[model samples]
Target: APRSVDWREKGYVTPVKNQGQCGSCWAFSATGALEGQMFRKTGRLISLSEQNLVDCSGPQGNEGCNGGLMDYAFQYVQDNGGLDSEESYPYEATEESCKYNPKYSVANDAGFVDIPKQEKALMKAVATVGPISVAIDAGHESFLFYKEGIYFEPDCSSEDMDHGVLVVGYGFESTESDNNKYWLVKNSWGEEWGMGGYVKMAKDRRNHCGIASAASYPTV
Candidate 1:
């Protein structure tokens, strides 16, 4: 079984909205993950704007409401002055006009950074770096869920999931039902769902929802 890190133990969980039915799971994951990271670093959970990244990143492929890479999204935030609060920028998940504010940071061509690929490297980054962005196959009707206990079935596969999330922490669950170390994941489906908008993923699996390739935005 692969080793995992528990982020929640460190204290951090700022809920983020998906902003309607938009499919920009990539953007949400990237922003959500980074928001956790920012909180971890500064000890303040600020609402970063996903709509800002959606409109200003100039990301290609998957459209604004579709999927993209969390790494690329981090690059966009780094290059820009980071993202603003949803209270400041607001959300319009759909592709809309890029409302630029001269007083605020609005610049494309944000530089990119390389994220570690190996689990150890990824784990180190998660422990010492910041919040990590991850993609999960939230396919089964159960996937849309947010509750407690091992909510996932062993038969589940990543090809079925179309959503992305942030890895905040990990821990071991000991009960009559399941006894395994799991990753504490944060979702964008609002707080009313799943353990207060969070999920527990099996940590030993190599590619559980392609989480092995989950990317982190190390503070540069």
Candidate 2:
């Protein structure tokens, strides 16, 4: 792996978005990955519609605003032919009836891959791939109030993934002698939260908070 990799710097990432009170992080995570894939393939970064997944993906096992899974959302995207744009089918936070228009389709995915459940594999995928969708144990209050710095909650569960996020890249901070590595995580909590809706999660700590447990990426 390289010393650092940030898709945002390479113009492969869309701006931070807010998922609001809806349990729609899964949709954001799915779209985040698809958005990266579209950017890499078309040389354009366009935000995909999470609402499209929230409303139409229920048939694919996604529970809309209640909650969802990224792989399921990916299946929904593939089955739906493609996903619309945030501008064409803007997010309403709450779940509403499906109104997806194929004419507004902005991105599409043929399939997705589930990475091997390991931190090394996850890191390598992020370094080689553009961005990856990951489910994490984001239930802690500390995680909600994260402001800055490399976040590490020892109490965070490794399996109970209550929220979804995207791993845009990875990097290390020099602390005199040792290098403190962390995952560059993109949250759907809007830019008002943590480093502009992003978090530097402590890395190489045995898959802290289930970051590597359910990582996946969309295929163009």
Candidate 3:
């Protein structure tokens, strides 16, 4: 693998989204991966609708605002033919009835690829592919206060994947003698939250905080 890479630098990652108080990170994660796939295939980045997944994806085993899984959301996208733009369907930040319009779909996904349950595999996936949907132990307060730095919470559970996020890029930092590996994570907590709605998570540490617990990306 290359020593360093950043998908955002190549214009594959999409803008950060905000799920508000809703437990809809899973939907955002799914949508972000689809956006990255579309960008990789067409050299065009267009925002997709998370609300479409939030509502229409329930039949695919998603819990809507209550919570969801990325695989199910991906299946929903594939089975439904594709997804639309936020402008067409829009996000309401709350659980609502399914109201998807096929005419407004902006992109499509034929299937999804699941990275093996290994950190090295995941790094390779991100470096080779585009963005990917990942779950992490984002339940800690320290994670919320993370500003600018490689985050590593020793106390964070490796399986506490209460939240979903998008891994847009990855690279090493010189802080630990140029040995610090980090993941550029795109979050749905708004721009003011972290680095413009992003987080650099420490990697190569036995899948710290469950960063590699559940990882996958969309396929065009």
Candidate 4:
């Protein structure tokens, strides 16, 4: 296997997006994975609408802007035939009536796979399957103001995953003292958050922050 993989550098990742004052991180995570899949299939990086999932996925168990899970969002896209483009539906960052149009639909995830509960498995999946949706315990003060470096929050939880993000890549950073390994995470909190809306969380630390606990990827 290669020592590292970065989908963003490979031109598969879209621009960083802002989810605003909403708990729609799950929608962003799901769409980010699907966007990568779509790019791999059609050679086009089309931005899917998070608002479409937020507004239409209520019956599929997603609570709009309140909260959600990536698996359910994927199912909703499957059942609805596909998802609309960000330009078509747009993101209001709030709960609103469903306004999806099939004509504006851009991509579809026929199915998805839940990775084994191991950091090694998650790494393999990311190297081979494009971007993957993963959840984390992002309730710590350090996480809220994370900017750079290999983030290792000792207080972060491994079971109580309260936020969703995408794992786009993994690599090792050499320092004078130690070789630090990290997973390149994409957040929906916009480019103002971490390293251009991304975070390099310490990897192989027994699934730090539950990143590998409920990891999944959509199949185009």
Candidate 5:
């Protein structure tokens, strides 16, 4: 009965998205988590609006396009009622008036839970609680230019987490050096980025830019 659950392969993770020049990676990660949770719960896939959070989540203490946190965006969704479907509210990269129409809201979470700081705890959360929103220090040029293969950023910092992404699944692969464990991260940099809009970061004690440093998941 045990098996690896790649949400993308299971039809939970949606198509990759490009956050463009906006620093709204938080919004994309939030959307990814919510999308995965909703599909897991209702077996339906619906695109939510990142623009809704970009413009309307400001009251939740987030700076639009500049920077924002997933916890803040999650609370913004609960407070503002619910997130509108992407069909009703699409992303434009640039900040604009929130076209949030609650009547068109597609999904909602009662709340979100932050996983423990321990690597083991974070791994358990991803395996059992659906995809999670994570913040990582992606300041390294290697991250921006990441094309394929396991990413091991030795210079990555745990104290400088500025980029937000989603962790959909995890696994290990035997390599020349040794067995390489990796976290299947879904980035918002479009499908042209890493391995088809995803990245396999070194999922070890190194934590790789502290991807497991700060993580949270929706409570569907």
Candidate 6:
């Protein structure tokens, strides 16, 4: 029955926002993961604010917009009250003041979790809890692509990789065309993208091009 649980059936979908040329993909990645999680938990697919995670997630590395550790952001939410919906907090890509009740911002003392080693644990937690925050190795063209199917980015493993995204759910394909043996991954590249804003990769492939490296979700 594992295949019976279609995450989209839970009404988890939102318009993908382009992070543009900014390196704020870390923020978008965290927010996208949490947004799906929030939808799974509350059945509300509200566009939560990514800018909140960007400005308040602490002193991230120079790759702020380019890349970051999702575990760190998860810890920030756990200690803090958690992030707010886009309607309440909104997003501007660039750093800006946190609107709404700043008092609702989750405390920034939860600390960070290890990466790669903790990847499996984080995915397990997200499947059991809700949407998890993740930062994949989205290279240059990734920012422009608006389709789906196994993305073949030669730069996916590049050192300058700078992009973030969410892993909504994982399931095997149901068609023989793809052998029905791949993982169905939901993305935020807008509905016009591949498979309506989702992507698929070999389930046995593990972290496709380091795509499954930095991932984290709420433990509470």
Candidate topping TM-score: 4
Candidates in order have lDDT scores of 0.64, 0.91, 0.88, 0.92, 0.86, 0.55
lDDT tens per residue, model 1, 1-220: 2255655655555654655687677777776666666666567766666777677767533356665667776776665555667677888768776664535532222443455555556556566655677767777777765478655566666455556788776667785755576777777777777887778876656556656565555353
Against the true structure, what is each candidate's TM-score? 0.80, 0.97, 0.96, 0.97, 0.95, 0.70
- Give a tens-digit lDDT track for model 5, residues 106-184: 9888878998776677788888877889998888889989987778877888768998899998887777767378888
lDDT of 3 by residue, 1-220 (tens): 8867788889887777789888899999998888889998998888999998998898899998899999899999889887889999889988888888889888988888889989989988988898899999988889889898888888988877898999987887778545488988999999999889999898888798888889999888
The residue-level lDDT of candidate 5 at 202 comes to 76
Candidate 2 vs candidate 6: the lDDT winner is 2
Clashing pairs in 2: none
> Candidates ranked by TM-score, best first?
4, 2, 3, 5, 1, 6
Instruction: Give the per-residue lDDT of model 6 (tens digit) for 142-176.
Output: 63563654555544552333455666566664554
RMSD of each: 3.6, 1.3, 1.3, 1.0, 1.5, 4.3
> Candidate 3's C-alpha lDDT?
0.88
Models ranked on lDDT: 4, 2, 3, 5, 1, 6
Candidate 2 residues 1-220, lDDT tens each? 7979999998889999998889999999999999998999999889889999999999989999999999998898889898899999999899999998999998888889999999999989999888999989988899989998788898987888788999999998865435389999999999999999999988888789999999999889
**Residue 113 in candidate 4 has what lDDT?**
90
User: lDDT (0-100) at residue 5 of candidate 6?
Assistant: 32
